Amino acid sequence: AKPPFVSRSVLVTGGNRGIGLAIAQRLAADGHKVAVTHRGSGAPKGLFGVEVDVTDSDAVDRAFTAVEEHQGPVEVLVSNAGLSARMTEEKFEKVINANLTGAFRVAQRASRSMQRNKFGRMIFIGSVSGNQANYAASKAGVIGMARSIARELSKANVTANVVAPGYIDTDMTRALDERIQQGALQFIPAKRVGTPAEVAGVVSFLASEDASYISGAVIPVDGGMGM
Amino acid sequence: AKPPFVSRSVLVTGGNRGIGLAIAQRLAADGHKVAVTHRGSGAPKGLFGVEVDVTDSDAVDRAFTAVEEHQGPVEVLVSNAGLSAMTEEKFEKVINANLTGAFRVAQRASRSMQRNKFGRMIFIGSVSQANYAASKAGVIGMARSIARELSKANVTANVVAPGYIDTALQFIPAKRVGTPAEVAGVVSFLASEDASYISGAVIPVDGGMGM
Amino acid sequence: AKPPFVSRSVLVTGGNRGIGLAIAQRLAADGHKVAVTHRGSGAPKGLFGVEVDVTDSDAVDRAFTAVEEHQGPVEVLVSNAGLSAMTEEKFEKVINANLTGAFRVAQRASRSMQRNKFGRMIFIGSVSQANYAASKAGVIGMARSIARELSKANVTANVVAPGYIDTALQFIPAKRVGTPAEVAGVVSFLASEDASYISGAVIPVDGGMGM
Amino acid sequence: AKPPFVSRSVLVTGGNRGIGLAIAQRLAADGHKVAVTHRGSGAPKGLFGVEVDVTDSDAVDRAFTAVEEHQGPVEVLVSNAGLSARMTEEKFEKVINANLTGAFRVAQRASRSMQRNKFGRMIFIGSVSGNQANYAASKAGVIGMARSIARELSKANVTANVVAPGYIDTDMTRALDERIQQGALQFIPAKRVGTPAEVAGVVSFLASEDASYISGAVIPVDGGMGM
Ligand SMILES: [Cs+]
């Protein structure tokens, strides 16, 4: 007794690259109407692209307006980490503004339409493993924020969940010392890195009709690492 | 890309009523080969059934053998609570059915999963007593131990933790109770090819309740 | 919109080998409840099986009853050729198994389908003899008669006409033989909720051969 | 053992209205990248639109080029009837040019890329029931053409099939005399009209990986009418 599929208006922030790209392509093949944000390079073929820096509340507003006009109001928001990568105030605030406050900005802009239409799915994608304290603070902060949103908006059938990837095969992970790669594996029960498609599949589920009674959850996609 | 579907040999314990029944029916509609255990009331129409008291290790063993003969070795094990829902007797009865029972079915499933380098163990928490709380938290610790040991063999162990399901609302952000189908959909996902890199997780299906 | 999936009670005759087996396995992975008939070699692992000689009307009747008891009344009937693949004896043997056999299973299925206002009869033509040609064309005429009478009750009858399937290429535009999975996919569609307004059709699955 | 889904670049001619719209929406929800042609009014939200009159070979060429640039070369072509609706030469040639020659033009423009990439699905949608001789000639002509294409191109994994709808619920069918509506039913074993979604489901199948060994076929979607 599987709920019938509904084609949703989807916005995937940072959806032209890496894990964000895998997510956007998967949601498109699922049957959804998928738009992505980017910082200039553009969306790949078959996806509607809008340029926006998530540190800029006006650019966020214009992005959502453009998507609304293209494919209808955003029903499923996938917020990917704006940045991924001793410590200092500038580096701390830069990461917080992009990854935590940036997540707030897109969630806030999505919320009114989601509440009004009594449907919404906010799905926040944590930054990858693995600048320690700034990324740690922003990722944990997004989880606290998502829980607050879930507590406020779940009564309107608007949920907010977090996908927490562990070590995933990306360009930066492959650039890491051969020595760091094989020994990150010592912390991972699965004894292998995850793939972008493995993250995308979990997002596919959270966007689907099957995830309606999940709200305020953090689903780790990490081969057991974070236990 | 979305990974190709694989029809799995599935066993759902307590798969004849309530949430277990919803899970069994959903996994069958997904395309899996679904067997259930039950305590006497019989299996649902269409599905292979075996009578098991999960406090009985011998009965668990002969159930798995019967299922292997019918549809092949169990690849996906869904362990539903033996009891729903303080004396030493009541405490021990719930621990034996809900915690040790989970161990019995997990242990019996484990050899074949490890050998074939594929397994999904999915434990379903009871709906919501020191006894029930201990057994539910206990199963989570057990699952995490199994995930730590066996994830390297592509054998994962995850928990679905339902809140209030209809088979009080002030404490639930959704302002409604969940349905058995809403639990079943999460189990469908965890049984699927899309859940391969999830292990040792507890997924709450509670409308935000236990956040 | 795409109509919601419904898990149907399916019977596939000759569903234990070749194209029939591929059909049965595909329909089971689709989410249906799949039973097969066979002539002695047994059913595939996982699926409910009944021994039927389709020249025997009594054996057909007791097969349908056994299937009804197991998984509910047959909603989707897939009739595969009794024989694969000139004397009066050889002619009559092929007609009796392939044409009259199709009638026997169709007739037995028809009452319940009409009563419940749902039925899909799907006849699978033999792969490619005056006897075989007569029986294959005969089944098409029979199916068309059934479709004319019963489509008003949401009971349709369609034919899949395979060409050369691997269980010569110069006469095939595709320049290759078809696979059993390629036949099974067409049967999956005809069993689905998307085939509701198709009735009395013959769908060739032949890479262009019989065009 | 179902073939894994592949997201195809789809062009549905006349895909902004009626049966064509139902087809385009279904193929989009299936997971494909769907573009439609129209004659000016535009594509609905979530579908890429291009304007083209299928009597104009240059406009067809430009349409396919625009789709190619948007979503990749056309892999699945759904050619819907340009026109639907005593007899005279002008009315005969008008319908032949739109419905038969128009089908040729789009098939021809699709063919080279399909052959080169060793994949293609041409799906021709016959005009609805039910100007007699011109529509009859064009619909039968499209079937002969499709069979020729199937004979030539099936060796390159390029197939050509026809969906032949009977009486389907559309704006024009509903405009027909109450008396003609209920008595068209006397010719239909199903004893009801079909829906646009019933046609779209058959097109979904013909576009899918399950239809690979079907070529040169005419699938009637008519509740048994045309037996
Ligand atoms: Cs099944």
mmCIF file of C-alpha atoms in Angstrom, chain A residues 1-3 26 30 146-148 150-157 166-168 187-195 197-198 200-202 204-205 209-227, chain B residues 1-3 25-26 29-30 143-145 147-154 163-165 172-179 181-182 184-186 188-189 193-209 211:
data_model
loop_
_atom_site.group_PDB
_atom_site.id
_atom_site.type_symbol
_atom_site.label_atom_id
_atom_site.label_comp_id
_atom_site.label_asym_id
_atom_site.label_seq_id
_atom_site.Cartn_x
_atom_site.Cartn_y
_atom_site.Cartn_z
ATOM 1 C CA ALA A 1 0.000 0.000 0.000
ATOM 2 C CA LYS A 2 2.492 2.597 -1.240
ATOM 3 C CA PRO A 3 1.278 6.218 -1.452
ATOM 4 C CA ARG A 26 18.039 11.622 -8.619
ATOM 5 C CA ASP A 30 12.168 10.249 -9.532
ATOM 6 C CA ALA A 146 15.737 22.063 11.795
ATOM 7 C CA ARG A 147 14.297 20.768 15.062
ATOM 8 C CA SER A 148 12.873 24.174 15.871
ATOM 9 C CA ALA A 150 9.889 20.847 12.803
ATOM 10 C CA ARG A 151 8.359 21.756 16.159
ATOM 11 C CA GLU A 152 6.709 24.910 14.697
ATOM 12 C CA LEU A 153 5.569 23.744 11.284
ATOM 13 C CA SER A 154 4.840 19.987 11.448
ATOM 14 C CA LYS A 155 1.200 20.787 12.325
ATOM 15 C CA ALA A 156 0.923 22.308 8.796
ATOM 16 C CA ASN A 157 2.374 19.147 7.210
ATOM 17 C CA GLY A 166 30.011 10.782 6.716
ATOM 18 C CA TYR A 167 32.949 10.253 4.388
ATOM 19 C CA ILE A 168 31.661 10.481 0.829
ATOM 20 C CA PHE A 187 36.584 4.888 11.906
ATOM 21 C CA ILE A 188 33.935 3.454 9.506
ATOM 22 C CA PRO A 189 32.290 0.091 10.290
ATOM 23 C CA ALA A 190 31.388 -0.337 6.591
ATOM 24 C CA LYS A 191 35.159 -0.068 5.824
ATOM 25 C CA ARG A 192 34.495 1.983 2.717
ATOM 26 C CA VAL A 193 33.586 5.529 1.712
ATOM 27 C CA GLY A 194 30.021 6.321 0.672
ATOM 28 C CA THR A 195 28.992 7.518 -2.800
ATOM 29 C CA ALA A 197 24.240 8.323 -5.012
ATOM 30 C CA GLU A 198 24.005 6.830 -1.512
ATOM 31 C CA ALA A 200 20.879 11.049 -2.993
ATOM 32 C CA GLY A 201 18.833 7.931 -2.271
ATOM 33 C CA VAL A 202 18.147 9.043 1.299
ATOM 34 C CA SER A 204 14.828 10.765 -2.499
ATOM 35 C CA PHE A 205 13.151 8.975 0.421
ATOM 36 C CA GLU A 209 5.277 10.397 0.166
ATOM 37 C CA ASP A 210 6.687 7.674 2.466
ATOM 38 C CA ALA A 211 8.436 10.158 4.755
ATOM 39 C CA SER A 212 5.346 12.096 5.947
ATOM 40 C CA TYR A 213 5.549 11.102 9.655
ATOM 41 C CA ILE A 214 9.310 11.732 9.929
ATOM 42 C CA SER A 215 10.031 15.204 11.306
ATOM 43 C CA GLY A 216 12.966 16.587 13.302
ATOM 44 C CA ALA A 217 15.102 13.537 12.435
ATOM 45 C CA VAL A 218 18.819 13.307 11.654
ATOM 46 C CA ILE A 219 19.536 10.382 9.352
ATOM 47 C CA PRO A 220 23.259 9.530 9.255
ATOM 48 C CA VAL A 221 24.585 8.287 5.919
ATOM 49 C CA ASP A 222 27.995 7.248 7.111
ATOM 50 C CA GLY A 223 28.456 3.465 7.105
ATOM 51 C CA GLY A 224 28.089 3.476 10.897
ATOM 52 C CA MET A 225 30.814 6.066 11.596
ATOM 53 C CA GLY A 226 28.973 8.464 13.876
ATOM 54 C CA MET A 227 27.513 5.981 16.385
ATOM 55 C CA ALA B 1 21.501 6.782 -10.534
ATOM 56 C CA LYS B 2 18.840 4.772 -8.658
ATOM 57 C CA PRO B 3 20.201 1.263 -7.995
ATOM 58 C CA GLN B 25 2.125 -6.262 2.970
ATOM 59 C CA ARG B 26 4.192 -3.264 1.853
ATOM 60 C CA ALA B 29 3.941 -5.116 -2.898
ATOM 61 C CA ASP B 30 7.519 -3.779 -3.276
ATOM 62 C CA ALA B 143 21.747 -3.160 16.848
ATOM 63 C CA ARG B 144 24.667 -0.781 17.172
ATOM 64 C CA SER B 145 26.962 -3.599 18.288
ATOM 65 C CA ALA B 147 26.339 -2.786 12.951
ATOM 66 C CA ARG B 148 29.833 -2.178 14.338
ATOM 67 C CA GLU B 149 30.823 -5.843 13.781
ATOM 68 C CA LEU B 150 29.091 -6.777 10.542
ATOM 69 C CA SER B 151 28.788 -3.627 8.383
ATOM 70 C CA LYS B 152 32.121 -4.536 6.805
ATOM 71 C CA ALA B 153 30.368 -7.635 5.359
ATOM 72 C CA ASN B 154 27.544 -5.519 3.910
ATOM 73 C CA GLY B 163 5.845 7.117 18.204
ATOM 74 C CA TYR B 164 2.081 6.979 18.586
ATOM 75 C CA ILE B 165 0.669 4.813 15.799
ATOM 76 C CA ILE B 172 3.339 15.448 19.020
ATOM 77 C CA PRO B 173 4.365 18.361 16.727
ATOM 78 C CA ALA B 174 2.368 16.807 13.810
ATOM 79 C CA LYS B 175 -0.812 17.103 15.932
ATOM 80 C CA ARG B 176 -1.851 13.683 14.647
ATOM 81 C CA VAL B 177 -1.101 10.005 15.207
ATOM 82 C CA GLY B 178 0.844 8.030 12.617
ATOM 83 C CA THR B 179 -0.513 5.164 10.526
ATOM 84 C CA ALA B 181 1.536 2.509 6.431
ATOM 85 C CA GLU B 182 3.753 5.405 7.554
ATOM 86 C CA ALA B 184 5.882 0.450 6.656
ATOM 87 C CA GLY B 185 7.211 3.038 4.187
ATOM 88 C CA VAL B 186 10.296 3.638 6.305
ATOM 89 C CA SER B 188 10.487 -0.318 2.727
ATOM 90 C CA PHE B 189 13.273 2.268 2.377
ATOM 91 C CA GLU B 193 19.005 -0.661 -2.325
ATOM 92 C CA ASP B 194 18.981 3.051 -1.333
ATOM 93 C CA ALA B 195 19.816 2.326 2.316
ATOM 94 C CA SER B 196 23.197 0.625 1.781
ATOM 95 C CA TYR B 197 25.337 3.241 3.611
ATOM 96 C CA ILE B 198 22.981 3.595 6.586
ATOM 97 C CA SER B 199 24.027 1.431 9.538
ATOM 98 C CA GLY B 200 23.507 1.737 13.277
ATOM 99 C CA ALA B 201 20.818 4.386 12.782
ATOM 100 C CA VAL B 202 17.640 4.980 14.731
ATOM 101 C CA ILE B 203 14.992 6.549 12.548
ATOM 102 C CA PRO B 204 12.103 8.003 14.512
ATOM 103 C CA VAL B 205 8.692 7.814 12.886
ATOM 104 C CA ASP B 206 6.831 9.900 15.398
ATOM 105 C CA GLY B 207 5.681 13.210 13.907
ATOM 106 C CA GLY B 208 8.454 14.920 15.880
ATOM 107 C CA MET B 209 7.547 13.502 19.347
ATOM 108 C CA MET B 211 12.960 14.770 18.986
#
